[PDB]
Design a protein around this nucleic acid. Structure first.
Ligand SMILES: [Mg+2]
Ligand SMILES: [Mg+2]
Ligand SMILES: [Mg+2]
Ligand SMILES: [Mg+2]
Ligand SMILES: [Mg+2]
Ligand SMILES: [Mg+2]
Ligand SMILES: [Mg+2]
Ligand SMILES: [Mg+2]
Ligand SMILES: [Mg+2]
Ligand SMILES: [Mg+2]
Ligand SMILES: [Mg+2]
Ligand SMILES: [Mg+2]
Ligand SMILES: [Mg+2]
Ligand SMILES: [Mg+2]
Ligand SMILES: [Mg+2]
Ligand SMILES: [Mg+2]
Ligand SMILES: [Mg+2]
Ligand SMILES: [Mg+2]
Ligand SMILES: [Mg+2]
Ligand SMILES: [Mg+2]
Ligand SMILES: [Mg+2]
Ligand SMILES: [Mg+2]
Ligand SMILES: [Mg+2]
Ligand SMILES: [Mg+2]
Ligand SMILES: [Mg+2]
Ligand SMILES: [Mg+2]
Ligand SMILES: [Mg+2]
Ligand SMILES: [Mg+2]
Ligand SMILES: [Mg+2]
Ligand SMILES: [Mg+2]
Ligand SMILES: [Mg+2]
Ligand SMILES: [Mg+2]
Ligand SMILES: [Mg+2]
Ligand SMILES: [Mg+2]
Ligand SMILES: [Mg+2]
Ligand SMILES: [Mg+2]
Ligand SMILES: [Mg+2]
Ligand SMILES: [Mg+2]
Ligand SMILES: [Mg+2]
Ligand SMILES: [Mg+2]
Ligand SMILES: [Mg+2]
Ligand SMILES: [Mg+2]
Ligand SMILES: [Mg+2]
Ligand SMILES: [Mg+2]
Ligand SMILES: [Mg+2]
Ligand SMILES: [Mg+2]
Ligand SMILES: [Mg+2]
Ligand SMILES: [Mg+2]
Ligand SMILES: [Mg+2]
Ligand SMILES: [Mg+2]
Ligand SMILES: [Mg+2]
Ligand SMILES: [Mg+2]
Ligand SMILES: [Mg+2]
Ligand SMILES: [Mg+2]
Ligand SMILES: [Mg+2]
Ligand SMILES: [Mg+2]
Ligand SMILES: [Mg+2]
Ligand SMILES: [Mg+2]
Ligand SMILES: [Mg+2]
Ligand SMILES: [Mg+2]
Ligand SMILES: [Mg+2]
Ligand SMILES: [Mg+2]
Ligand SMILES: [Mg+2]
Ligand SMILES: [Mg+2]
Ligand SMILES: [Mg+2]
Ligand SMILES: [Mg+2]
Ligand SMILES: [Mg+2]
Ligand SMILES: [Mg+2]
Ligand SMILES: [Mg+2]
Ligand SMILES: [Mg+2]
Ligand SMILES: [Mg+2]
Ligand SMILES: [Mg+2]
Ligand SMILES: [Mg+2]
Ligand SMILES: [Mg+2]
Ligand SMILES: [Mg+2]
Ligand SMILES: [Mg+2]
Ligand SMILES: [Mg+2]
Ligand SMILES: [Mg+2]
Ligand SMILES: [Mg+2]
Ligand SMILES: [Mg+2]
Ligand SMILES: [Mg+2]
Ligand SMILES: [Mg+2]
Ligand SMILES: [Mg+2]
Ligand SMILES: [Mg+2]
Ligand SMILES: [Mg+2]
Ligand SMILES: [Mg+2]
Ligand SMILES: [Mg+2]
Ligand SMILES: [Mg+2]
Ligand SMILES: [Mg+2]
Ligand SMILES: [Mg+2]
Ligand SMILES: [Mg+2]
Ligand SMILES: [Mg+2]
Ligand SMILES: [Mg+2]
Ligand SMILES: [Mg+2]
Ligand SMILES: [Mg+2]
Ligand SMILES: [Mg+2]
Ligand SMILES: [Mg+2]
Ligand SMILES: [Mg+2]
Ligand SMILES: [Mg+2]
Ligand SMILES: [Mg+2]
Ligand SMILES: [Mg+2]
Ligand SMILES: [Mg+2]
Ligand SMILES: [Mg+2]
Ligand SMILES: [Mg+2]
Ligand SMILES: [Mg+2]
Ligand SMILES: [Mg+2]
Ligand SMILES: [Mg+2]
Ligand SMILES: [Mg+2]
Ligand SMILES: [Mg+2]
Ligand SMILES: [Mg+2]
Ligand SMILES: [Mg+2]
Ligand SMILES: [Mg+2]
Ligand SMILES: [Mg+2]
Ligand SMILES: [Mg+2]
Ligand SMILES: [Mg+2]
Ligand SMILES: [Mg+2]
Ligand SMILES: [Mg+2]
Ligand SMILES: [Mg+2]
Ligand SMILES: [Mg+2]
Ligand SMILES: [Mg+2]
Ligand SMILES: [Mg+2]
Ligand SMILES: [Mg+2]
Ligand SMILES: [Mg+2]
Ligand SMILES: [Mg+2]
Ligand SMILES: [Mg+2]
Ligand SMILES: [Mg+2]
Ligand SMILES: [Mg+2]
Ligand SMILES: [Mg+2]
Ligand SMILES: [Mg+2]
Ligand SMILES: [Mg+2]
Ligand SMILES: [Mg+2]
Ligand SMILES: [Mg+2]
Ligand SMILES: [Mg+2]
Ligand SMILES: [Mg+2]
Ligand SMILES: [Mg+2]
Ligand SMILES: [Mg+2]
Ligand SMILES: [Mg+2]
Ligand SMILES: [Mg+2]
Ligand SMILES: [Mg+2]
Ligand SMILES: [Zn+2]
Lengths: 252, 87, 112, 50
RNA sequence: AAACUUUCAACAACGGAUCUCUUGGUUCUCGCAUCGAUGAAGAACGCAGCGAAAUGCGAUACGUAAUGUGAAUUGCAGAAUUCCGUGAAUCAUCGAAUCUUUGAACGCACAUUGCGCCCCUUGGUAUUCCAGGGGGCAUGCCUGUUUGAGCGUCAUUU
RNA sequence: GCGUUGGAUUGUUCACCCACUAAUAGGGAACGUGAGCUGGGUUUAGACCGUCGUGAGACAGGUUAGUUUUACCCUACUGAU
RNA sequence: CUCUUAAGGUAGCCAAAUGCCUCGUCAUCUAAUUAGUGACGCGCAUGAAUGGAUUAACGAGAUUCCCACUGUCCCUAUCUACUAUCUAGCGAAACCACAGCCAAGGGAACGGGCUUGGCAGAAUCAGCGGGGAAAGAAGACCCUGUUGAGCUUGACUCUAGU
RNA sequence: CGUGGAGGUCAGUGACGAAGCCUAGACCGUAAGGUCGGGUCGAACGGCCUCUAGUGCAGAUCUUGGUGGUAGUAGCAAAUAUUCAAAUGAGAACUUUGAAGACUGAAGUGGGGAAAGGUUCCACGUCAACAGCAGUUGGACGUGGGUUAGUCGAUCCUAAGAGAUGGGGAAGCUCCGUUUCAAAGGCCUGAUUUUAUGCAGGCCACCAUCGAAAGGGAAUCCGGUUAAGAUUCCGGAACCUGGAUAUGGAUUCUUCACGGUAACGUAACUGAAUGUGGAGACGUCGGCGCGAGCCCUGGGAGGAGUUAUCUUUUCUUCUUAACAGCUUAUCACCCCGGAAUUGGUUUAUCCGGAGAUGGGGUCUUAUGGCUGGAAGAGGCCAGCACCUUUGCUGGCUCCGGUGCGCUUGUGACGGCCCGUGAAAAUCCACAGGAAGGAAUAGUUUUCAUGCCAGGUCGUACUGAUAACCGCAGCAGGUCUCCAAGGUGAACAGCCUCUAGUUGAUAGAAUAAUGUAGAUAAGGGAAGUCGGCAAAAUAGAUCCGUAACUUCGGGAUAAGGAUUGGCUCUAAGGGUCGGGUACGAUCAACUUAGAACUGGUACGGACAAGGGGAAUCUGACUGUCUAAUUAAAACAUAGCAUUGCGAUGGUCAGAAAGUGAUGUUGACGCAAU
RNA sequence: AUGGUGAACUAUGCCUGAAUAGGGUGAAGCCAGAGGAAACUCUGGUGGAGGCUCGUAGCGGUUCUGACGUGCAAAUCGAUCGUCGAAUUUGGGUAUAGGGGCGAAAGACUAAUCGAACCAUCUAGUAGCUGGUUCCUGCCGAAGUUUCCCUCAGGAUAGCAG
RNA sequence: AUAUUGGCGAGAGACCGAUAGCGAACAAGUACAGUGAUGGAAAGAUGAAAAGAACUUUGAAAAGAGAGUGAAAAAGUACGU
């Protein structure tokens, strides 16, 4: 038959990101001499909606240590941070909502957001509205720090990797029913072309594994192997269990 | 509506005139000529199209310079001038 | 009754194609094209329209004398005045508190 | 069309000039063989395709 | 009995077979080796006393120069000095030129007759702004010239 | 020779009941009759269910939606010169 | 109690767009109902996100009944415009073995022609739909062919990828 | 037996007529065929022996061309509609002019444009073809004429995106990448007084380019003018950009202006690097406020129409551009003051000790006013002149009113979002203070005035029931601006003014059958698969409304009454002076009540929901099979499951220093 | 099969523009009033919410199974109808290209072409099948049977014939 | 010494004879179709010579009827047969 929908996504012709109104990429400061020996001060100048994003961004500006001028940065705003607020970034900074410190300088239990997976990568973990990572221990020899991500996973990263104190703003966005098709419309209109969604079970065989039959139905197990092949992976990929999850989840 | 009501909306060109070959096969959005290949340094042609070739090979135009090569060959690529004689 | 026509080839109601009807000396109605309205210069500190300052489309500011583009204070046609009160006060105090900060820790160092 | 390029207008000019009957003296030339102009175009019978 | 229909013939229609033509084609054979950055093949637009084409040509435009020939060219008009002649011709030949806008196409662009830079020169009271005339500036690579870079590296300073 | 009907249910033919009536006989005419109609059923392409099949799909099972072309000639026939 | 399974259909729902038998049986609506609805249920073959049951509101969705309405009908009639029709000018097409009156017989088992009978008189106009097994496409269905293609799968034989 | 070519031969036939064609004339042969005569014709051709093959037609739904019967037949019937007379002409249903009857009805059959076309525009000539009758007419035919810009567009900028270059893949055509893993380039002046431009500073590292005739954007208007051009020509009057610059003014002995408590004022009032700010620059809907034009309307001065009678009447002209001076504003802000008895305040409930209400000031110049432009223009009239170019002379062109009006603009606000609604060129400003500057005379071109220049291409017209696309002058399709009066809720329908049409073969009759439009006594779905079709209902005011429900609905549920004309009454507003109770006048349809009145009619045409009870089924709104299926199908919110922490999941690619998600990070992306 | 050409129609995304009479309904917020021992409950205004609703333009295309059905037209015309402020309509620009796209999913749509577009070439593709196969006369003159065959509409073999 | 459906120059044929021969004997890769790639025709012949019909007449004209030219209009730019 033909190439199915989930294979056409990859050439991203009509599947690229709707990017025009975006404020620019959100990132921590480049890890320089300031941030990595002392601290440097900025001011949050503006906290602002970024199309397609849930959490607002915070525009923060710092003096350039090496040239006379102002260099502006695009943060994700943590709940609580405000215009006019002074933001402190650096190894020798202090534990306040909004500041940005390396995980090695913050006690166990600290709550942080936008943390780096390697030092200097300018931020990777816990950016979505409401998310955060908890520091749960340090190993001072080979300076690592163990953290717990939004997903539940624990992971150890360099104690030099940086994070910003607190939680990302916009929480509870998903507590509210969309109610109508149209709000999803405007939702995905500012993201990418993934909406709405025809069930493969409503297409013909040319179109999809699930396609065809004189009743709608999948007709074989819908849990597909990891080592299945492009054109085969529709359904429950690599699913280690299936069915209604019964009883407390919670990573132990 | 796929027939004549829809033919009424045909008022936009896919191709214009091609600088190199004159033909009106210069595809605007593609910026390349469906006939001669412009602006490919080479000229489109295909051995499965002998007619098209014959439509465009050397000799179908003026041959402004090549015309004269065989006379010039014939007289051993002469230089100078002819002299003079009598009656 | 006297209806009217665009005076330029563009036939669409785009922002650059606004029309105003007007009675000529010939005693008839005729369209006149209209430039977009200028918006007022704003303050770099607070964002309000800054008073004293003319409002022109941007290149039209070169066509116009310097006094239309300033008020005669520090930061004249740039920041908003109550904004410069703030700047001054805060500057003075912070430059003062600096001497205060220094003399304390000059004292800490000798009383330790 | 109606706010044109020089290229199209140049072509239209060549087109207007080629649009006329046989110059009748030609009919009288020794061994003349051309009756009439067989390449006559008309704006409402055949389109130029630019 | 006509009209009508049908058959034959004669003259007239309709149509373009047939016969006879043939500056075309097709096949064979022989001789020869020459496109282009010294801008080719191709394209566009132009050019004649009176041309829409085909053929030719390029603002020097159905042609300029040169050479041979020896009196045309011709649809009409024309010149008339060109006829015992450096000399007619829509002649032949062709060695010298002109060769618009383009095209591998080369300052950058090009659905634009769009937009720079450099040199010499002319005009506007002008090294600087504007306008006219001429002449220039693509890319890869090779040999060479010049100016340079690198504690890659030698020696030489006091 | 002459008549042989009006209705409820069904796409129905058939069947079945109400009712009238003198009687509500049975048949043929390409199972008369679609350039005469209708298009409800059947029987293409949409679609739901049930049964079967790993599946595409199937079903003499049930459902819903689903373009009906032309006569001016000849004869026949009706009338008309 | 007994065979047997991985477990042996639970809450619900039903002759339901799912019930063969079937026009199921009982009730209701009607003069009369293979319709409709309410019931019943050993249900050929109902049933739980293969989602079951319930649902206000919404529907050019399928179905049944009532009121109003009415030419749908009993049962047809009449009127207007434009046609058809007749004239001047203008002027195609489909189709065409040859053609064009039947009865019967025989015959490739349904004749315009053949055999035997009926019969038969120029040239024609408007209508018409009986026939021309009229016309429109080298059967839609069915079979054959050592003819395909779309599609599926532990068919045969391979392959990108992994 | 016959045909095209070949070798031989008959010293074959022939312009005194070869070949070919015609011919119910002749003759030979069983036949394929052969021979003759006659007519037509015009240049070549044949017998016999032999050689050779692209060598013989009725068929192939054969190929190409031609031609019939059909047949003077189907037809030339959608878009309301035509008529009289003159003129022209060989010729007039169809051309032109006059008259009349109508239509489109400002959601136009009006006036312009985008795309597309390309001369169709305009004039003169003119009918063979073409405009399914005609033709003297034409978008036809012939011959000509016609498109004028510093200010309108393009050109500049950036958008999605396209795409060179150092590079990396690829046998290669080429694919990848676009600031990437590159030694990526140019400005400001100083140094020159061999001299023309080498070096001396310091920066700036931004690393192509194409991509919008609707986005961004320097700048022009009115009047006149042509057969056909006009924001482009002419007249007048402006403005912008670049380059030159001199005079005046301003500034300075306190060098780089004063004034104001302040918001801030101004005719000026030096300012390199660098930095920073603003503008460009931004959704949508609601009411409210204001502007413009349009609409309505009084007085007056003109011209026209009607006048048996009636009407101080009906119709119409009374206009003012860009640009410049003064002036003008909601908002906002300053000074004074110090607030409970809380006050101020919007239609919309927001504001005040973080300083209200009050009083007094400052600012933006949208917009408007008066004056300049400018009455000299334009508009409307009267009085003479004369084949003529066409003049000449006069007047008047004035003062008001109204608003939930209509269209458009704009402001201060308010609603909405898991939606919060471009970019760049370009212009200015401020912080800074490198520097350069006077008293025997300097500084100043962001003040005034003055000089020069502004190229290149487009520019006619159509924009559609005939200029575009549908084979065509096709009832189809094809983006947009302007928008009068009445009725009325209305940009509805119906009638009308301005403009524009009056194009669509015609004549005569009115049989059947039709198509489209109507009506029917009595019955009332008995018709039919089925109420298919049709009919019934309808506006507004008042009365009155059930089960059930997610409490929002269901609901215009259902069911009723009323409605014209004329004549009265009542209620609902503005503006003003009041020492520290009222008066006076001017200007609006709304709502309710009451009389009278008519053949009981009145949403009088137009316009305008049938309702009810249930079963099945999809929650809803939304979506599809263009051209037989609109549905119960798809979607959807909601519910649930799966994969994944980037050295990753899903996906792309022949490959890659390649790519999508990703400007992303589990409140995420991907997959059911 | 190979190499080319198409997103002027249409599907979907992106960028930049434009467009939508008049009504009905009356959500939050807000103001005033009334009851009550209290907790609290009520009334009248104001306001102007919604993939709300009546209905034009628009966009769509339900029924007549109406017209037309050698048309105005290779999809139209009339009536009637769906929706009409947003998952709205729509210009231009721009992206995606054929085992490919695009698909609120119909095997739809991808220029009157779609269960694999169009162009050229490989290609005079193969055909046990269907059609046709062109002058005369003279002499002779059949078979539908045997055997084997993915053989049963075909061959080979023998026979019959010259 | 070998190759050669291209190019330039030549000589030829038991070859084709205008539906044949190359698609094109001609203003043929033209005209015309298609957005594009591409597709792609029809169409030769008066006579030795234009001597291409002066002139008259009917007609609005085209033309007709005479005349005339020519070996022939039974060759009249519709043109050999
Ligand atoms: Mg992107
Ligand atoms: Mg989508
Ligand atoms: Mg879905
Ligand atoms: Mg899903
Ligand atoms: Mg399906
Ligand atoms: Mg599959
Ligand atoms: Mg599978
Ligand atoms: Mg399936
Ligand atoms: Mg299922
Ligand atoms: Mg199609
Ligand atoms: Mg077409
Ligand atoms: Mg395109
Ligand atoms: Mg390319
Ligand atoms: Mg090139
Ligand atoms: Mg205009
Ligand atoms: Mg000012
Ligand atoms: Mg000022
Ligand atoms: Mg004869
Ligand atoms: Mg000859
Ligand atoms: Mg030859
Ligand atoms: Mg030879
Ligand atoms: Mg070439
Ligand atoms: Mg010539
Ligand atoms: Mg000489
Ligand atoms: Mg010559
Ligand atoms: Mg020259
Ligand atoms: Mg029988
Ligand atoms: Mg029958
Ligand atoms: Mg019949
Ligand atoms: Mg039928
Ligand atoms: Mg049916
Ligand atoms: Mg239907
Ligand atoms: Mg017929
Ligand atoms: Mg009929
Ligand atoms: Mg008839
Ligand atoms: Mg049951
Ligand atoms: Mg049932
Ligand atoms: Mg029953
Ligand atoms: Mg049983
Ligand atoms: Mg089930
Ligand atoms: Mg419920
Ligand atoms: Mg319904
Ligand atoms: Mg039912
Ligand atoms: Mg008839
Ligand atoms: Mg008569
Ligand atoms: Mg016809
Ligand atoms: Mg018989
Ligand atoms: Mg008998
Ligand atoms: Mg027969
Ligand atoms: Mg019949
Ligand atoms: Mg017939
Ligand atoms: Mg068959
Ligand atoms: Mg077989
Ligand atoms: Mg298929
Ligand atoms: Mg198997
Ligand atoms: Mg397997
Ligand atoms: Mg022979
Ligand atoms: Mg031959
Ligand atoms: Mg004889
Ligand atoms: Mg001869
Ligand atoms: Mg022989
Ligand atoms: Mg042959
Ligand atoms: Mg035969
Ligand atoms: Mg024949
Ligand atoms: Mg035959
Ligand atoms: Mg035969
Ligand atoms: Mg006739
Ligand atoms: Mg007739
Ligand atoms: Mg008709
Ligand atoms: Mg008429
Ligand atoms: Mg009217
Ligand atoms: Mg209207
Ligand atoms: Mg018209
Ligand atoms: Mg116009
Ligand atoms: Mg045109
Ligand atoms: Mg005529
Ligand atoms: Mg015409
Ligand atoms: Mg320019
Ligand atoms: Mg590239
Ligand atoms: Mg550009
Ligand atoms: Mg522009
Ligand atoms: Mg613009
Ligand atoms: Mg002029
Ligand atoms: Mg001063
Ligand atoms: Mg914008
Ligand atoms: Mg202006
Ligand atoms: Mg004061
Ligand atoms: Mg906002
Ligand atoms: Mg400014
Ligand atoms: Mg027109
Ligand atoms: Mg055409
Ligand atoms: Mg049309
Ligand atoms: Mg008009
Ligand atoms: Mg007509
Ligand atoms: Mg009509
Ligand atoms: Mg009745
Ligand atoms: Mg009744
Ligand atoms: Mg039924
Ligand atoms: Mg029934
Ligand atoms: Mg109800
Ligand atoms: Mg639904
Ligand atoms: Mg719906
Ligand atoms: Mg359909
Ligand atoms: Mg529907
Ligand atoms: Mg649920
Ligand atoms: Mg690599
Ligand atoms: Mg398109
Ligand atoms: Mg209403
Ligand atoms: Mg709605
Ligand atoms: Mg509605
Ligand atoms: Mg209404
Ligand atoms: Mg719709
Ligand atoms: Mg129908
Ligand atoms: Mg018919
Ligand atoms: Mg409607
Ligand atoms: Mg595939
Ligand atoms: Mg394939
Ligand atoms: Mg592929
Ligand atoms: Mg299917
Ligand atoms: Mg096609
Ligand atoms: Mg063959
Ligand atoms: Mg074949
Ligand atoms: Mg066989
Ligand atoms: Mg075998
Ligand atoms: Mg056999
Ligand atoms: Mg057979
Ligand atoms: Mg030889
Ligand atoms: Mg030929
Ligand atoms: Mg032959
Ligand atoms: Mg040919
Ligand atoms: Mg020849
Ligand atoms: Mg031709
Ligand atoms: Mg001849
Ligand atoms: Mg001939
Ligand atoms: Mg001749
Ligand atoms: Mg004559
Ligand atoms: Mg003769
Ligand atoms: Mg002759
Ligand atoms: Mg003649
Ligand atoms: Zn080309």
């Amino acid at each position: 038959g033909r190439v199915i929908r989930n294979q056409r996504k990859g050439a991203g012709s009509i599947f690229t990101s709707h990017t025009r109104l975006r404020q620019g990429a959100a990132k921590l400061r480049t890890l320089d001499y300031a941030e990595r020996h002392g601290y440097i001060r900025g001011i949050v100048k503006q906290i602002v909606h970024d199309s397609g994003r849930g959490a607002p961004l915070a525009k923060v500006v710092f003096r350039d240590p090496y040239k006379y001028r102002l260099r502006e940065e695009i943060f994700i705003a943590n709940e609580g941070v405000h215009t006019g607020q002074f933001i402190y970034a650096g190894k020798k900074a202090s534990l306040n909502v909004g500041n940005v410190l390396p995980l090695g300088s913050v006690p166990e239990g600290t709550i942080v957001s936008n943390v780096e997976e390697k030092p200097g990568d300018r931020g990777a973990l816990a950016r979505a509205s409401g998310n955060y990572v908890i520091i749960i221990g340090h190993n001072p020899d080979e300076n690592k720090t163990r953290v717990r991500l939004p997903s539940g996973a624990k992971k150890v990263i360099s104690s030099d990797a940086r994070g910003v104190i607190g939680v990302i703003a916009g929480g509870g966005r998903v507590d509210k029913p969309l109610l109508k098709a149209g709000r999803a419309f405007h939702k995905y209109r500012l993201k990418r072309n993934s909406w709405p969604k025809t069930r493969g079970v409503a297409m013909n065989p040319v179109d999809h594994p699930h396609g065809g039959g004189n009743h709608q139905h999948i007709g074989k197990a819908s849990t597909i192997s990891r080592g299945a092949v492009s054109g085969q992976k529709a359904g429950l990929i690599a699913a280690r269990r299936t069915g209604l999850l019964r009883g407390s989840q919670k990573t132990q | 509506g796929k027939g004549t009501p829809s033919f009424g909306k045909r008022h936009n060109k896919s191709h214009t005139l091609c600088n190199r070959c004159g033909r009106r096969s210069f595809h605007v959005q593609k910026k390349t000529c469906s006939s001669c290949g412009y602006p490919a340094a080479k000229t489109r042609s295909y051995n499965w199209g002998a007619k098209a070739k014959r439509r465009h090979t050397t000799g179908t135009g003026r041959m402004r310079y090549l015309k004269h090569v065989s006379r010039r060959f014939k007289n051993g690529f002469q230089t100078g001038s002819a002299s003079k004689a009598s009656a | 009754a006297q209806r009217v026509t665009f005076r330029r080839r563009n036939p669409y109601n785009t922002r650059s194609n606004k029309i105003k009807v007007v009675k000529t000396p010939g005693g008839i109605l005729r369209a006149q094209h209209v430039k977009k309205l200028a918006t007022r210069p704003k303050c770099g500190d607070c964002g309000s329209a800054l008073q004293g300052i003319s409002t022109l489309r941007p290149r039209q500011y070169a066509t116009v004398s310097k006094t239309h583009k300033t008020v005669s204070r520090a930061y004249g046609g740039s920041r908003c005045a109550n904004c410069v009160k703030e700047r001054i006060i805060r500057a003075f105090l912070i430059e003062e508190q600096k001497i205060v900060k220094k003399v304390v820790k000059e004292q800490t160092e000798a009383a330790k | 069309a109606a706010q044109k390029s020089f290229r199209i207008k140049q072509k239209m000019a060549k087109a207007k000039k080629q649009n006329r009957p046989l110059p009748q003296w030609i009919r009288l030339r020794t061994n003349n063989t051309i009756r009439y102009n067989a390449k006559r175009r008309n704006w409402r019978r055949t389109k130029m395709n630019i």
